[PDB]
Structure formats: C-alpha cells, structure tokens
Design a protein around this ligand. Structure first.
Ligand SMILES: *[C@@H]1O[C@H](CO)[C@@H](O)[C@H](O)[C@H]1NC(C)=O
Ligand SMILES: *[C@@H]1O[C@H](CO)[C@@H](O)[C@H](O)[C@H]1NC(C)=O
Ligand SMILES: *[C@@H]1O[C@H](CO)[C@@H](O)[C@H](O)[C@H]1NC(C)=O
Ligand SMILES: *[C@@H]1O[C@H](CO)[C@@H](O)[C@H](O)[C@H]1NC(C)=O
Ligand SMILES: *[C@@H]1O[C@H](CO)[C@@H](O)[C@H](O)[C@H]1NC(C)=O
Ligand SMILES: [Ca+2]
Ligand SMILES: [Ca+2]
Ligand SMILES: [Ca+2]
Ligand SMILES: [Ca+2]
Lengths: 482, 511
C-alpha cells in the first residue's frame, strides 16, 4: 500500500551567512558538515519511518544574509519561505534553512505541519548545534512537514508515551542525551497522513546523489546499472537480478514495485491504489522498475461527496478539520449551529477579530466563519489554546468551538481556506466566494463542459489521466486493446 | 675464505650490512668488527667458530636483544667495544665467561638501564666506558652506583638523563642513600556494579559520605564509610525518575540535597536526624528549570547559594538563595542559552588584591562566560567571554602557588589549561580530547593532579610539574565513559571515585 512503500524526502539545504562564518568561511566545510547532518537524520528516518532523506540541492549565503534573521524561529521561517518562493527555483520536496544563529524559543527549529510537497509550506528552519544534535533538530522539523505532531491529547491522556526513559523520543524536548526513536504513535500519525492523501511528492526515488557513486547504497548512481541496497537486504529483492551493481544475463531490472524476478511488470498493472477520493491510482509504465510518480486530482475536485474539496491531495472538510484539532471522536456541528451563531458575530461565533471587536458574519459567509464542533474536549491535538472553549446549545444542537494558535497570525478555530460553503463555492479569508475566485488552472479538453473530454481526470501536474481504452493528451481518442 | 659481507686480512675481519652473524669467518682471525648490520639479535654462542678472538667491535648497528652468554667461548677476548648502536635489551649474563676482558665499552648506545651484576666475574677489567647513554636513575640502577664505588676499573663521569629530579646528576656522585624508590599511584579499590552520572562528597556530623546519581534507575545513592571493614556501605537512597545531579549542601550541621531531574521536575530534600530519613520540603518549578545538567554550590559573605545550569532554551540558568527555611530564586542568567556547566570562582581583578566571587557558564556551540559578583546589587553582572574557546563543555578551577587556573573540557578537539593573570585567562597547555566529558583538577596530599576522561580511549591522569609549570603524564586509568572524578579524604586515606556512564563506577586508592 502507501505505508509499506519506501518514501523519499528530496531535501534542499540553505546555509545562511552565520552558518558560513561558523565553518570559517569555508564552502567545502559547510557542505560536508550539512551532509553529515542530513545523513544522520537519514539514518534515523530510514530505520523507523521507512523514509529516506536525500540531499538533492544546496546553496550557501557566502556574501551576506538575504534577509534579517529573527530570534523568533516562526518569524524567521516565514521570511525564509518567502525567499524560497521568489528566489529558489530548483526542485525539491522540502527546503530547510541551516542557521548559524541560536533562537530565543523553546524549540531548536520550526516547520509547517503537513508542509511537504508545497511551495509555501514545504520547508523548515534549524538552528546550529553539534552534528548529532542538529540531525535530531532536522528530524523533528521534517517530522512536522511529514505530518508528525506529538498529539497532546493522547500525551495528556497517556494514550501515547515514550518508552525510552533515558534518551527520550525525537518529538520531545531535547537535552544533552539525544533521542534516537520515534514513538509508535508518531508512526500511526505518519501513516494516517499518507492515507489522508499527503506526501505525494515523496514517491519519486532519487538516482544520482551529490556524492561519489557507492555500490550498496540503495541508489542507482553514475556508472552502475542497478543497486539493490545492502547484501543482507538484497537477498530479499534483487539478489538474482543484480551482481555488483550490474544487471545479470536475463534481467531488465533489479528491484522495485514494477519489477518481477528481474523483469519489468506489464503496462496497466496497479502499483499504487488511491488512498482516498482525491487520489489517482498509478499503473506501471512497463518501461521502468519503479512505480510511477504519485500524483492525484488537481485542486478543485470534490471529496466526501460534496462536503469537501481536494487541496494537495487532502480533503478539506469542516468535519475533518474538527477531527484534526480536537480528536477523531469529535464531529462537526450541524449547519444550523453556524446559521445562527456566526451571524451574531459574538465571542461564541464570528468571522474574525478586528481591534478588540469581533466581526459579524454575513448570511452567505456563514460557513466560512468560526469553526463549530460537537463532543469537543478541553485539549487540542496541536498548538496552544488561547482563551476558553465556546459551548452553545425539534432538536437542540450543541455548538462547540475554540481558538487554537499555532502562530500569532495563524488561528485554528476558524474555517480553513478552501473549505466548501455551497455549490461551487469555497471559503477565502472568512468569505464565501465562487470557484472562479480561486483561479484554478484547467486541463486540455476537446468536449465543452467536460474535464479531459469527459474521458479522464485532471491531475495535480495539470495533465489528463485517461480512462481505460482512451488515449491522447485530451483523452478524446479511443484505443481498443485487450 | 672471507665472507662476502666482510673484508678480511690474516688477523682482522670487517663486516658490513651482515644479515646474520656469519658462521664462516676464518677461525684464525683475532679482531672482528660489525658495522651497519642487518641482524637484530645476538644469541648465545654466536662467536664459537672464532674462538681465538682478542677484539670485537660493534658500531652503527640496531639490536633487539643481546642474549645471555652471547660472548661465551671467547677466553682470549680482551677488548669488547659496543658503541654507537641502538640496543633494546642487554641481559644479566651477556658478558659471562669474559674473564680475560681488559676494556669494555658500552658508550653512546642511549641505554636507559643496565641489569644488576652485568659486570660480575669480569676480573681483568681495567677500563669501562659508559658515557653517551641515557640512564634512568631509579631503583634498577642502584647496583651500578655501588659498583662504581667499589671497582678498580677506570670509569668516566656519567650522568642521569632521568627521572627529571635526577637529570644531569652525576651518577658517580650518587649514594645508596639517594634512590627515590617510593612514589605514588592510583590503585583500584573496588568496582560498584552500577552506572553513575555525577558523584558528590560531603561531611555530615563528622562522618564522610558519598552521593552517587543513578540516571537510569532514578536513585540518589548515598554511601557511608565503614571504619572497621574499610569499605563503603549503602547509607541511604533518594528516588527521582531521571536524576542528573545530587548536590549536598550542609548549612550549620543540617544536610540538604538538591536533586536535578530531567523528568518530573527538580526537588529539594532535607535530612532528618530524628526520623533518620530524607524529607521532600521544596519543589523547584518545572517551567523555569527544565533540562538541568550541572549544580554548583558556593558561599558569599555568610550567604548560601546554588546554581542550576539548564541545557534547554526556555529554561534559564538560575541562582537560588538560602533564607533560613529553604531556597528561592535570586537571579537568572544567560537567557535562551543551552548552558551545560557552572563553575564558581574566586579571582583577583587587577588592580585589586582580594579575591572576588565569579561564575563561569559553558554553553553549546558558544564561548564560556565570566560573570562578576556585584555587592551593591547582590547579583552577578559584567559578563565577559573567554576568547580562544569555542564549544567548551565544562570549566573547573584549581590553585597552585596562589595563582588561579582553570581546566576547559571539549568532547572532540583539544582540552585546554589556562592561568588567570589579573584581567584575563592565558594559554598554558593543550591536550587532545577523544570523546572527553571531564577534565577534573584534584589536589591530594598537597599534590596537584588533573584527570582527563575519555569515551573512546583510556582516561589520562596528569600531575603538576613545578619546574615546567605544566601538567605531565602520570598514570593511566581505564573506565567506560567517565562523567566525573571526585576526591574522598578519610583519616589519611585518599580515595578517587570515577563515575561510569555505560560501565561500572570505580573507586581508586591513592598510595
Ligand atoms: C521506453 O520509453 C521510450 C520513450 O520514453 C521508448 O522510446 C522506448 O522504446 C521504451 N523502451 C522499451 C523497452 O519499451
Ligand atoms: C487569481 O486571483 C488572485 C487574486 O484574487 C491573483 O493574485 C492571481 O494572480 C490570480 N490568478 C491568475 C492565474 O491570474
Ligand atoms: C680490587 O681491589 C681490591 C682491593 O680491596 C682487591 O682486593 C680486588 O682483588 C681488586 N679486584 C679487581 C677485579 O681489580
Ligand atoms: C535503596 O537501597 C535498598 C537496598 O540497599 C534498595 O532495596 C532500594 O531499592 C534502594 N532505593 C533507591 C531509591 O535507591
Ligand atoms: C561593567 O559594569 C560597569 C558598572 O560600573 C560598567 O561601567 C561597564 O560598562 C560594565 N561592562 C560590561 C562589559 O558590561
Ligand atoms: Ca521527491
Ligand atoms: Ca549506488
Ligand atoms: Ca496517487
Ligand atoms: Ca559544574
């Protein structure tokens, strides 16, 4: 499935000016030092999350800083991602900043949750430290991106605990004695995130690294035709196929989901099933040993009936957002709860806060206001609770809400942008706007009123995925083939 | 016929680059010389095929061993010149059977010793040359001093090249009186079957106790001295889930223990003389102190304090003050820093003449900081960095000849020793740190020691050299991942406790 596959984090490292000064203005020292950090973070990820951290790109600010580094990591993070948006043009699953400075917060770094594969959220920031220490810093930073958050609800309840009494666990507060392991709860969160449609860009396996070719690395580099892994694990897959990084007499490939006993899997074979109604299944090309790059439906497709709309392969519903913040047992409130409280614009329901005063929601922009849930608890799964939890009461409906702050600017407890508020309408900055307001791109279509000639689905790469027996970039040509 | 490696006349043979002592030297030769030879050993009876030798010369060779009876079977040998060679070992009976020997030279071989009775039975000796060697003047050389005093043979003045207190001393001028044969060492007392992080000692009601922090179990293990069985028993225990430090404070005969924990928070315990137990009387808040790593105690003008280094960011290094009933916050230092260790110092600031209280903080990827005590505001200020030092783990101070020094510890790279000179610290020496976590100075019986721990290799013990004004290699210990070294003094008996992070904590005896 999607959790038994080996994942790959295509990572880019940016070294700021202070990091450059720490290694005595040396480019080669900065590179090897960062590679050490990445490699050790990789060895952590490889063992437990079944995921590789592969360095694919790097640059170092040798002259001076591109922007002002803040003692606040969250402030620094945002300015870095702005730099990433406007100045970084190399491709990566995530871009992380290595700062030579030291932050004035409780954490040694900061990173957006569920951020990977994104241009604005796909990154994190990490402060300087010893090689082993910064590796842990990168691990917990990439953890947030990869969807791993220390569920405070299960932590407080005792549902999830670190069994390591001494070294502790990665998502915990770091001291001199460094952690080495994720909790089982962290693993499930990671599995849930992938099953939720996240981490789509993580299934492309890198080939040529930034280092000299190494036979027995699990990567097909320059000169070598294949690379099974380690001689121990090569026995499982690739033993008969690959000998000293060279294809045998009767072999087209070595290992992979589309490789069967040193031979290619025929075209049309399912190698990765859709994890949800936002995803597109992947079939073997027949010409490659690896399964096709994990793609999904573009932003705009509906999910959970008409209750949700796909964004980055994930379904944005008020129901899921409530489960995301307060727990799986929590469900979204009835629409009647919104239709009454949000219009008031009180503390118990509103469309935002403007200078000590709440905004009274409009009657159309009611589904884009204060988030309302049922059977709520008293501790969010993530972030900090700012204030108290709102609880409002033929049927009588219990409307519950709450202000959860990840950032000083970002407030969970309001309807997330992109959440449906009606037929072909979504929420944007606490306002119910039509689909045209989001300026979604479109695939090629040779039939009016249909997506991909009504014979295909528009992928997130803006390409048409044709149904069975249909071909062409517009999926209009019919192709009969047993 | 003459061997190929040799040049021969009727009476003489000169051999060069010989790979072994040739057995084919013409048996009528009376003088034989070996120069720049290949062979490394001279075994017994090596010259029996040339029984009429009167003279033998060895020069510019390298020997592993010259064995017993190497020169046996040579009753006419009157001259034996062994000079300008490298010689690893000479044996007691090397010259046995050389009753006719008139002149023996062992000059310029850089010999460090000679075995007792090496010259026994050499009754014809008129001359012995011993110059140009490197004799160590210790107990093993005692026989030579006596021999020099009694021999009729002519022997030139020769000099000790060691030990340092004997260097350039004329050996001919030594007596049996002068041998320093006694000397100290850290001998292994016992190995306690458990792991430990920090070890502390104190005096309670005129008995000496030892506190051991057990990280993995949770225990603060108190040890007590048995004056009849001459060992350490298990006095009492203190439970705390993740203890890092167990610092004892004795205020007016009452014992207090600060227990730093990584989990559940830190607490303060008080020993009860009546109930014969430890009581938990105070709780340090978990939010101000989160990741403690070191506790130090000190006294400034009849006021008691202690400082807790917090290796976390949100947790600030905080000073507490004794106010008769308990300890309370006095001052926070180094906000947002990952402070690893604290050290209390009493140092003279130029041009003052009196020592004033100082604090030193070590933090990750940062320079050590020196705080100065301000009597007016009753808090430490005026911080200054220690230059030349990046990523220092811990600092510890000692005093010799009134001057104040410190020991700077690194994990990798090189540890440093510095002297205080009025305004700042100055470089004295440096030592390679192979996974070092400790560089603890200790003063035992007015001897200044310095123990540099190592996780990768052996723990090195240093001694202070008065002539060199520096630490020198002394004894080499073997402990798994040492975390601390503490000196325990009980009734003229000096013990050395060595904490082990993965192996067994070890107790040493100083004799
Ligand atoms: C692999 O794909 C290329 C097109 O990208 C095609 O030209 C080639 O023939 C294919 N190889 C095989 C063995 O089918
Ligand atoms: C869509 O609208 C936003 C503002 O509403 C604008 O910034 C963006 O450029 C538009 N997209 C396109 C493709 O024009
Ligand atoms: C050395 O002199 C002493 C005089 O006391 C004499 O008895 C002894 O025989 C002499 N021995 C040698 C080897 O010269
Ligand atoms: C203290 O020692 C006793 C026996 O010596 C042992 O049974 C007990 O578990 C120990 N407790 C702690 C906290 O060290
Ligand atoms: C130290 O404190 C004194 C207070 O008299 C002040 O004049 C001086 O500037 C301070 N120096 C530093 C480095 O803080
Ligand atoms: Ca990728
Ligand atoms: Ca390879
Ligand atoms: Ca897919
Ligand atoms: Ca200390």
């Amino acid at each position: 499935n999607v959790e038994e596959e080996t994942k790959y984090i295509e990572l880019m490292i940016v070294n700021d000016h202070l990091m450059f000064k720490k290694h005595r203005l040396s480019v080669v020292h900065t590179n090897t030092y960062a590679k050490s950090v990445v490699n050790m973070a990789d060895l952590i990820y490889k063992d437990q999350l079944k995921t590789r951290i592969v360095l694919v790109a790097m640059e170092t600010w040798a002259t001076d800083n591109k922007f002002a580094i803040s003692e606040n990591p969250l402030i620094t993070l945002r300015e870095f991602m702005k730099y990433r948006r406007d100045f970084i043009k190399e491709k990566s699953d995530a871009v992380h900043l290595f700062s030579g400075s030291q932050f004035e917060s409780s954490r040694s770094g900061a990173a957006y949750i569920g951020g990977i594969c994104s241009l604005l959220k796909g990154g994190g920031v990490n402060e300087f430290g010893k090689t082993d220490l910064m590796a842990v810093t990168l691990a917990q930073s990439l953890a947030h991106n990869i969807g791993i958050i220390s569920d405070k609800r299960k932590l407080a309840s005792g549902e999830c605990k670190c069994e390591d009494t001494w070294s502790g666990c990665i998502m915990g507060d770091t001291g001199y004695y460094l952690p080495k392991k994720f909790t089982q709860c962290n693993i499930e969160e990671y599995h849930d995130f992938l099953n939720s449609g996240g981490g789509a860009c993580l299934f492309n396996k890198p080939s040529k690294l930034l280092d000299p070719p190494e036979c027995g690395n699990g990567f097909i580099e320059t000169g070598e035709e294949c690379d099974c892994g380690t001689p121990a694990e090569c026995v499982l897959e690739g033993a008969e196929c690959c000998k000293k990084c060279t294809l045998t007499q009767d072999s087209q490939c070595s290992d992979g989901l589309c490789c069967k006993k040193c031979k290619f899997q025929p075209m049309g074979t399912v190698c990765r099933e859709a994890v949800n109604d936002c995803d597109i299944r992947e079939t073997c090309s027949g010409n490659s040993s690896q399964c096709a790059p994990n793609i999904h439906k573009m932003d705009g497709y509906s999910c959970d009936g008409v209750q949700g709309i796909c964004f980055g392969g994930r379904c944005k519903t008020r129901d899921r957002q409530c489960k995301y913040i307060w727990g799986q047992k929590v469900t979204a409130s009835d629409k009647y709860c919104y239709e009454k409280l949000n219009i008031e614009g009180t503390e118990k329901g509103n469309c935002g806060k403007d200078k000590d005063t709440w905004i009274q929601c409009n009657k159309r922009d009611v589904l884009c206001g204060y988030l309302l849930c049922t059977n709520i608890g008293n501790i969010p799964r993530l972030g900090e609770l700012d204030g108290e939890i709102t609880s409002t009461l033929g049927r009588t409906l219990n409307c519950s809400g709450g202000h959860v702050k990840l950032e000083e600017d970002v407030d969970l407890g309001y309807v997330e942008d992109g959440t449906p508020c009606g037929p072909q309408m979504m929420c944007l900055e606490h306002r119910c706007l039509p689909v045209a307001s989001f300026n979604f791109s479109t695939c090629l279509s040779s039939k009016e009123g249909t997506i991909c000639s009504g014979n295909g689905v528009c992928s997130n790469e803006l390409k048409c995925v044709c149904n069975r027996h249909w071909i062409g970039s517009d999926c209009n040509t019919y192709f009969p083939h047993n | 016929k003459c061997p190929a490696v040799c040049t021969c006349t009727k009476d003489n043979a000169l051999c060069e680059n010989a790979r072994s002592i040739p057995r084919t030297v013409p048996p009528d030769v009376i003088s034989l010389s070996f120069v720049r030879s290949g062979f490394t050993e001279i075994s017994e009876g090596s010259f029996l095929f040339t029984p009429s030798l009167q003279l033998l010369l060895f020069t510019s060779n390298s020997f592993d061993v010259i064995s017993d009876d190497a020169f046996i079977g040579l009753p006419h040998l009157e001259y034996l010149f062994i000079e300008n060679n490298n010689i690893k070992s000479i044996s007691r009976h090397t010259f046995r059977g050389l009753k006719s020997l008139i002149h023996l030279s062992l000059a310029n071989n850089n010999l460090q010793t000679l075995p007792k009775d090496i010259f026994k039975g050499l009754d014809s000796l008129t001359n012995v040359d011993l110059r140009g060697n490197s004799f160590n003047c210790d107990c093993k050389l005692k026989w030579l001093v006596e021999w020099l005093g009694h021999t009729n043979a002519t022997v030139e003045d020769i000099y000790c090249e060691g030990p340092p207190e004997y260097k350039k001393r004329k050996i001919n001028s030594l007596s049996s009186k002068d041998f320093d044969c006694i000397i100290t060492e850290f001998a292994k007392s016992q190995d306690l079957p458990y792991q430990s992080l920090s070890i502390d000692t104190f005096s309670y009601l005129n008995d000496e106790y030892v506190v051991i922090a057990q990280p993995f179990t949770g225990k603060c293990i108190f040890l007590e001295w048995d004056h009849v069985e001459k060992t350490f028993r298990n006095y009492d225990n203190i439970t705390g889930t993740s203890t890092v430090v167990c610092k004892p404070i004795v205020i007016e005969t009452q014992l207090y223990v600060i227990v730093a924990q990584l989990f559940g928070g830190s607490h303060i315990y008080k020993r009860d003389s009546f109930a014969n137990k430890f009581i938990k009387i105070q709780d340090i808040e978990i939010l101000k102190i989160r990741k403690p790593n070191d506790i130090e105690t000190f006294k400034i003008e009849n006021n008691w304090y202690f400082v807790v280094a917090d290796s976390s960011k949100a947790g600030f290094t905080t000073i507490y003050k004794w106010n008769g009933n308990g300890f309370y916050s006095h001052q926070s230092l180094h906000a947002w820093y990952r402070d690893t260790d604290v050290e209390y110092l009493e140092i003279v600031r130029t041009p003052q003449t009196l020592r004033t209280p100082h604090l030193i903080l070590s933090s990750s990827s940062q320079r050590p900081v020196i705080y100065q005590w301000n009597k007016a505001t009753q808090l430490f200020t005026n911080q200054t960095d220690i230059p030349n030092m990046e990523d220092v783990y811990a600092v510890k101070h000692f005093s010799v000849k009134g001057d104040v020094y410190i020991c700077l510890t690194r994990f990798i790279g090189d540890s440093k020793v510095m002297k205080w000179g009025g305004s700042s610290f100055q470089d004295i020496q440096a030592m390679p740190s192979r996974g070092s976590m400790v560089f603890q100075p200790l003063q035992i019986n007015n001897y200044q020691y310095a123990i540099l721990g190592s996780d990768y290799s052996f723990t090195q013990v240093y001694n202070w050299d008065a002539e060199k004004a520096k630490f020198v290699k002394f004894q080499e210990l073997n402990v798994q991942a040492p975390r601390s070294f503490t000196h325990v003094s009980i009734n003229k008996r000096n013990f050395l406790f060595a904490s082990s992070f993965k192996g067994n904590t070890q107790i040493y005896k100083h004799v």
